[PDB]
Amino acid sequence: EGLVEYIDAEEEESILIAMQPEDLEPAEDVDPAKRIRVSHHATTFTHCEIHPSMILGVAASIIPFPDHNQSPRNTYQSAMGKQAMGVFLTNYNVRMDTMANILYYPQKPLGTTRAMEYLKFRELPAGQNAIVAIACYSGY
């Protein structure tokens, strides 16, 4: 229907893309807590991003609020997210693998991500929701 279009890296050199349709597309008090967003005051947009969060990969889509983190920390999580015990498959009882780890009681995160719906993380989670306290209790 001509509503979406595949664009490669080479073709991006000759188009103008909008971050989101909420503000950049419409012709153009402010909350003090919201991040400072630049309108860019452009009236020649040719494409609009589906969602800026989609620039991330599979491993980086599990981090909650990755834009509130220092960039190197996100990289570490991506590598560590691949070493976390979980449920790799539902047929672990019929597969004879060299090594396999299964969590007793996997739980889905309390703070999730929209992209996390399409990774089946709510169906095959790797981790648990633990009550965490940040304190210097005993020096251990």
Partner 1 sequence: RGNLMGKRVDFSARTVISGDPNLELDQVGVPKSIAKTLTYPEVVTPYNIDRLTQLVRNGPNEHPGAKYVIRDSGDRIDLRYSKRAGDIQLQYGWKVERHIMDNDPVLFNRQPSLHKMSMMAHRVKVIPYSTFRLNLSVTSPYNADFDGDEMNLHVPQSEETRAELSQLCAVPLQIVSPQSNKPCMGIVQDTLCGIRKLTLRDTFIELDQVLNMLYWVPDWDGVIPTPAIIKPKPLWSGKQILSVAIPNGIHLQRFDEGTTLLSPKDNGMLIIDGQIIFGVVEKKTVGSSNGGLIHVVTREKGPQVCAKLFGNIQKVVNFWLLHNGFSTGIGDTIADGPTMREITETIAEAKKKVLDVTKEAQANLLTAKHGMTLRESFEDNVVRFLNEARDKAGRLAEVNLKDLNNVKQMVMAGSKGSFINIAQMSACVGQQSVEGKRIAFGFVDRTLPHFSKDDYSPESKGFVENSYLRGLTPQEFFFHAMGGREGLIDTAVKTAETGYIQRRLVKALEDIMVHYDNTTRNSLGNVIQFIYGEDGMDAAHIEKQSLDTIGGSDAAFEK
Partner 2 sequence: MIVPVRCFSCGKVVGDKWESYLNLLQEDELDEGTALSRLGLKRYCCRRMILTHVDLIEKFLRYNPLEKR
Partner 3 sequence: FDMGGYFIINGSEKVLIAQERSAGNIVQVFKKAAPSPISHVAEIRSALE
The SS3 of residue 55 is helix
By CB under 8 A, how many residues form the interface with partner 2? 19
The SS3 of residue 23 is coil
- Judged by beta carbon distances under 5 to 8 A according to partner kind, the member of partner 1, partner 2, partner 3, none in contact with residue 74 is partner 1
12 touches partner 3 by CB under 8 A? no
Binding span for partner 3 by CB under 8 A among 32-40, 69-77, 116-124, 127-135: 116-124
Question: 62: closest CA among 41, 46, 50, 76?
Answer: 76
Burial (CB count within 10 angstroms: exposed 0-12, middle 13-18, buried 19+), residue 87: middle
- Closer residue to partner 3, CB minimum distance, 66 or 127: 127
- Judged by beta carbon distances under 5 to 8 A according to partner kind, the member of partner 2, partner 3, partner 1, none in contact with residue 135 is partner 1
